[PDB]
């Protein structure tokens, strides 16, 4: 009639019942009297070294209070929702007896964010020594505004130690340095519930956690700006893109979409214009193909005819030796700084074989283009030798990206005068000591069989998922993915609101790339992401 | 000097302790009573179809035993080794009332292989009736030898449910299926245990179910076979595919990858070859390249000229309403069952721009070609004029594939004596009462304006996921996704171990495709789905 | 709603009542016991020998526990899925006074892998000398770790009987044939009992138990090469075959089918050829057809005309009983070695009697041929009087096996290099002190009347089964089978996972051949079979 | 201690007042795990137990009729068996 979520008339096992006299044979074997059991042992989180280097006032650790400092509670809160309750932070040490010094403990409380200087002490502090024996607890409180806490609450309880008066090895010169270690790790408490257990697979309505922007392997990468897969990544203080930049608002200013598909389009050629203006035929934005890509001539040409390159007058290459061996590879051809679009170009009448097509977005001027790095509906250009002979022809087409015709440049997107925005160029500077990087990624050229490097501001599945996925990140902070090569040289990437990655070194170097990508947590973009290196 | 798994001596937090008084309040919040919510209510597992069909001895529902039957337990069993205990399987039938049909259930002892005959109720059989007011639950006990299981263990008891009466309805159609469902729900069970604590580090994580094979769109959708979207749903009683066709093993006999980029190779001549074999640059197969098709000629032909098709055997003629108004079409052409791709078309020292392809696979002999469908390292094919006078080459090539050359043919996947398989073909045939499917997915066609429907086994995404996730399905078994259109109509699709796709209706005709998919869980693969139509 | 196992309305007997002073009548007639009757004699279960030959430390009878050692037992454990429990055993010998010598009898635990030596006598050893009238008892208890077993498990407690000392016959030293038969008789303990009612019709898992390989009378017996029956069998050290030969797997190197059906296949010659190459129609592997020979030509020849058979190197053409005289028949032919099939030359203009086939695998280089080791699509081939011209004459043919034609050459199957394999062959040397063995069947000739002898790797039964079902043995072991002929010698047929046969002596001579057959147990190979033999 | 399927039957709408629908003698053939056991014995004595399951749940008209004659008649296709 109307059943409850237990309700249902029992019939029972029709062979056997639950042998209750079995299971605790179980129970027999193992020491299973007690579920639960990570509330009564503690569990490693972190290591931390301290030498007679760092000195007085120094902050070793810093951690805030949350479920995530005890694993077992981070596998559990995929049910949940909520927390309430404190945490337990054991500290043990062993010194030699004859050493001295004595460390702080500090519990501050939430709204905080704490500062390696004494007038941190001018607060209740804790002291130890590095003689201490026994380990040493520190509850951490639960001290709230709220009832309760979500698990995307950072403004929390926080712990820090720090170095009261340093350490001092007797024995030891000056110039040698020693230094013993400090072991911590934790353990849920007493007063620690969860709260509102989520119905899977439901969709946490400010979002969901950003844990599959990166794919693990690398395999699975390949840029938003051109299909070949990553090799390296590339510093740069400024980084701008449009294409396929969305952000976890899941919007852009860009055209396109994360599809490598072609690009059907159509084109009214009269008398015998090789050229023309494609027009749209699918889209997002009125009058622009999807998928179309970002990048103007960088000079005014006429498109003509044939390759062209020198080695400065001008003994032009066909092979390696003079390519590899030139000094300058000037490239005197006249549809330099198009793509290459395998060209279906039907029509009817055209039984020929469909040549090949190239295109930028560009002014026409009556035989010529000029650049402009803003698309509209008429900067679309073309150049596909259609097969035509005053019989006007209105052949439909079909392309696709392959390779690039600037033969000499750098890699493409470096130069914002060139990039084609619409409106807007979506854009960062550094932020902290956390500096932007490009993706790396090998494209084909036309004439010299080489390859030339373009820059990508995201992969592509990074981008795939904002397009659809609502997330929370509060601006201020980064989507924190670790990085492993084959060796084990990692760092850390940050990932910003608006899509830009973010890491906090200067360079990289070289690394075995079949690396993988891992997560790790959110962290404030006001503090440098870490890096181990070599 | 020892210090056990908690012992440490105690500060408290110095500037305030845990109150329980506060987090009395959250539990004030919130209704929680208790931790551990799943051993206190249903969990949904599944929903079995039951139209008229199912003669009795007929199998609808086949479990075995362990945590898996409950998602909860299933997040919980990555931290145990070990369990132990009992489960209850509520059931429910749809038809309030109104239905008869009784329905029996079995549990079995471990170590079978239960059969669809009516021998399986030689044995104590509950049975029950359509017309149950109150849900029925069924605890599997746990029959075994050993103290405790593990969880790769499989050997266990295990339910199952089968026809006892064939229902009556006079409210149901041949075509459709709309009616019985039997729902399945779960619970752990009072003895439910688990055992023997792990750390994370390990966290195994295999156990994939079934969620992701399809999106919950079409929009996202397109062929294995070709980039297009989808648009409609096509039933042939046999099926056939081996480019990418993939299984729950995460293999095929399928030379490719799923994912559509172009195909790299590096063709030679000698003084004008417009055709030559193609070789690999990237592969996984020895030879063959990737993302390479699968349709052969239809016939002897030697590739050496232009476009021509002839209406009425009497004629040539180039518009559309020639090609409509046509007795038959004749293709008077030289590469007709070909494709569009679009070939760079590189080489060292080779100006006069690239021009276009068109490949497939066949046997090459001096100056034409024969179909061969076996395909080998030599039976690769190209007729792209590479401009080569008297001299070897060395054409470095790329090459997407884009289109099609063949007109008057209807259709692509339905002469399987011209698909291209290595040496096997994966097939299947109706089961049940399912039959196999298609996904039909528009194709270009070269000269002329029109199209071509392709057939398809495997969306695209769907044969992704099986090449890198390790999904779990027993031999005789769906995936079961559901479908509905946007005039609120509705059908579900099958998806076997294999990866042919299944469904249970006869026909689909038109519909609103602005469709949607979602997952309702496993069913048995011997057995009618569900639909409903109009 | 609900009924459950034993719910019913009770009317009863209508006219009468099941009383109860009736049936203790029945009982007093008759006497009773607890249900069960054979918990209080021996049943018979097997007789072994004991010959000169074996000397000290070697071993007879190795059976495992389980209720296979009751007939009794064998028969209802078709019911459960587990037994637990113990046995009693009698075993004796039927020796005469002067036949000294002594005899072992062991239990052994679980786990291990016993040795023909003296060792295992350190063991507590039962004795029975061969001069000890009456029999002795004891008993098998079921030393195990879980808390019952399963039939698809056989590593229990086992039964070991052991040469303590050897035989002794002092009168006939020439022969050395002598007998000492021993007996074998078990009587359950009354802790044994099963559990776990299988529900009927169901399999198991693991795997059913062989005892439905051969049949029962020599008169369903027939080859996996040769329809004809089998006559008698032969021994050799090396034995292999790869057409019908099926392991336990469930798999064959193989790409026939047990089966003796006619094949048909699609000639397509011209300009008389009469050597055509015949293509698939039905298969399982693709090209080669279903229940094609295995094979080869001895050497190359050029098939023109017809028979030719001659006493020697420089004389007649026999044609006529006076042939044995020659002792080297040699076959000077137009061809050799083919087998002879049946035809049904069906081509669309072709009014003519249609004509014999003389197929084998070879390749086709020219007008002649040579030998095909190893087999393909291109490797297969005929020699008809198919009626044709300079025109092609495609026909379907039908053909079916009859014969052979390689006059003179010795039974087929030893001729390693003339048999077929696709990539592998299964072989086998002796094992354990046994002997592989062929099974030999009769064919027929082209030209004279008689009959040629053929090796057989499995009857076709044994391969029917195993194509189908999923038995069990490990590789250890054996499949014992004891083999009687209409006089009371008889032996013991041991089969391996591969399907080979095995037998535990070196020479059969000859034996009445109605011969039948019986399933006994799982001997390992180390161990030698019976062999109660004149 | 339990009851095991043996059969089933058609009583469809052409079948009339009088038809048979089941008839056996008594035995072990009545259980498939009795027939299993009748090859480990030669004799037998004592009642069995039988039970129907109709599926017409609240639906299908109709009712049936049973007899247990005795040993030595051999019934007939008639009403008058109910007498
Ligand atoms: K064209
Ligand atoms: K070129
Ligand atoms: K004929």
Same mark, same amino acid.
């Given at each position: 009639? /109307?059943?409850?979520?237990?309700?249902?008339?029992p019939?029972?096992?029709?062979?056997?019942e639950?042998?209750?006299?079995?299971?605790?044979?179980?129970?027999?074997?193992?020491?299973?009297?007690?579920?639960?059991?990570?509330?009564?042992?503690?569990? %490693?989180?972190?290591?931390?070294?301290?030498?007679?280097?760092?000195?007085?006032?120094?902050?070793?650790?810093?951690?805030?209070?949350?479920?995530?400092?005890?694993?077992?509670?981070?596998?559990?809160?995929?049910?949940?929702?909520?927390?309430?309750?404190?945490i337990?932070?054991?500290?043990?040490?062993?010194?030699?007896?004859?050493?001295?010094?004595?460390?702080?403990?500090?519990?501050?409380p939430?709204?905080?964010?704490?500062?390696? #200087?004494?007038?941190?002490?001018?607060?209740?502090?804790?002291?130890?020594?590095?003689?201490?024996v026994?380990?040493?607890?520190?509850?951490?409180?639960?001290?709230?505004?709220?009832?309760?806490?979500?698990?995307?609450?950072?403004?929390?309880?926080?712990?820090?130690?720090?170095?009261? =008066?340093?350490?001092?090895?007797?024995?030891?010169?000056?110039?040698? #340095?020693?230094?013993?270690?400090?072991?911590?790790?934790?353990?849920?408490?007493?007063?620690?519930?969860?709260?509102?257990?989520?119905?899977?697979?439901?969709?946490?309505?400010?979002?969901?956690?950003?844990s599959?922007?990166?794919?693990?392997?690398?395999?699975?990468?390949?840029?938003?700006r051109?299909?070949?897969?990553?090799?390296?990544?590339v510093?740069?203080?400024?980084v701008?893109?449009?294409?396929?930049?969305?952000?976890?608002?899941?919007?852009?200013?860009?055209?396109?979409?994360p599809?490598?598909?072609?690009?059907?389009?159509?084109?009214?050629?009269?008398?015998?214009?090789?050229?023309?203006?494609?027009?749209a035929?699918?889209? /997002?934005?009125?009058?622009?193909?999807?998928?179309?890509?970002?990048?103007?001539?960088?000079?005014?040409?006429?498109?003509?005819?044939?390759?062209?390159?020198?080695?400065?007058?001008?003994?032009?290459?066909?092979?390696?030796?003079?390519?590899?061996?030139?000094?300058?590879?000037?490239? =005197?051809?006249?549809f330099?700084?198009?793509?290459?679009?395998?060209?279906?170009?039907?029509?009817?009448?055209?039984?020929?074989?469909?040549?090949?097509? %190239?295109?930028?977005?560009?002014?026409?001027?009556?035989?010529?283009?000029?650049?402009?790095?803003?698309?509209?509906?008429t900067?679309?250009?073309?150049?596909?030798?259609?097969?035509?002979?005053?019989?006007?022809?209105?052949?439909?087409?079909?392309?696709?990206?392959?390779?690039?015709?600037?033969?000499?440049?750098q890699?493409?997107?470096?130069?914002?005068?060139?990039?084609?925005?619409?409106?807007?160029?979506?854009?960062?500077?550094?932020?902290?000591?956390?500096?932007? $990087?490009?993706?790396? =990624?090998?494209?084909?050229?036309?004439?010299?069989?080489?390859?030339?490097?373009?820059? =990508?501001?995201?992969?592509?599945?990074?981008?795939?998922?904002?397009?659809?996925?609502?997330?929370?990140?509060?601006?201020?902070?980064?989507?924190?993915?670790?990085? $492993?090569?084959?060796?084990?040289?990692?760092?850390?990437?940050?990932?910003?609101?608006?899509?830009?990655?973010?890491?906090?070194?200067?360079?990289?170097?070289?690394l075995?790339?079949?690396?993988?990508?891992?997560?790790?947590?959110?962290?404030?973009?006001?503090?440098?992401?870490?890096?181990?290196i070599?």
């Open positions: 009639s /109307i059943t409850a979520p237990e309700q249902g008339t019939v029972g096992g029709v062979i056997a639950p042998s209750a006299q079995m299971s605790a044979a179980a129970d027999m074997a193992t020491g299973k009297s007690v579920d639960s059991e990570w509330e009564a042992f503690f569990s %490693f989180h972190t290591s931390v070294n301290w030498s007679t280097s760092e000195t007085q006032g120094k902050i070793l650790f810093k951690q805030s209070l949350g479920p995530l400092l005890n694993p077992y509670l981070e596998h559990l809160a995929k049910l949940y929702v909520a927390w309430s309750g404190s337990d932070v054991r500290f043990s040490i062993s010194g030699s007896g004859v050493f001295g010094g004595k460390l702080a403990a500090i519990v501050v939430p709204g905080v964010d704490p500062v390696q #200087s004494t007038s941190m002490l001018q607060y209740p502090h804790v002291l130890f020594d590095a003689r201490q026994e380990p040493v607890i520190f509850s951490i409180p639960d001290l709230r505004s709220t009832l309760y806490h979500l698990m995307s609450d950072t403004d929390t309880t926080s712990l820090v130690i720090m170095v009261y =008066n340093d350490l001092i090895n007797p024995y030891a010169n000056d110039s040698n #340095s020693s230094g013993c270690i400090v072991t911590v790790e934790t353990k849920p408490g007493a007063d620690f519930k969860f709260h509102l257990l989520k119905p899977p697979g439901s969709m946490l309505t400010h979002g969901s956690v950003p599959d922007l990166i794919p693990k392997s690398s395999s699975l990468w390949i840029g938003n051109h299909w070949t897969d990553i090799t390296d990544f510093i740069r203080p400024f701008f893109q449009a294409n396929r930049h969305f952000d976890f608002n899941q919007e852009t200013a860009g055209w396109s979409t599809r490598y598909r072609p690009i059907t389009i159509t084109i009214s050629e009269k008398n015998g214009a090789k050229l023309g203006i494609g027009v035929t699918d889209y /997002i934005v009125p009058g622009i193909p999807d998928g179309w890509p970002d990048t103007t001539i960088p000079e005014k040409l006429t498109p003509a005819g044939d390759y062209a390159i020198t080695n400065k007058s001008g003994n032009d290459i066909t092979t390696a030796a003079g390519y590899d061996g030139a000094d300058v590879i000037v490239n =005197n051809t006249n330099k700084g198009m793509y290459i679009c395998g060209s279906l170009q039907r029509a009817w009448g055209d039984k020929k074989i469909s040549n090949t097509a %190239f295109i930028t977005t560009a002014t026409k001027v009556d035989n010529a283009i000029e650049p402009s790095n803003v698309i509209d509906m900067k679309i250009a073309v150049y596909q030798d259609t097969h035509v002979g005053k019989e006007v022809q209105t052949s439909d087409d079909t392309l696709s990206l392959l390779g690039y015709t600037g033969i000499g440049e890699a493409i997107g470096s130069d914002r005068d060139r990039v084609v925005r619409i409106s807007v160029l979506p854009e960062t500077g550094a932020r902290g000591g956390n500096h932007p $990087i490009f993706y790396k =990624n090998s494209i084909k050229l036309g004439y010299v069989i080489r390859s030339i490097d373009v820059f =990508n501001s995201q992969i592509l599945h990074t981008s795939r998922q904002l397009s659809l996925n609502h997330y929370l990140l509060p601006p201020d902070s980064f989507a924190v993915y670790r990085i $492993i090569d084959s060796n084990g040289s990692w760092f850390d990437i940050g990932i910003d609101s608006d899509g830009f990655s973010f890491v906090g070194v200067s360079s990289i170097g070289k075995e790339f079949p690396l993988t990508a891992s997560y790790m947590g959110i962290q404030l973009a006001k503090i440098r992401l870490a890096s181990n070599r």
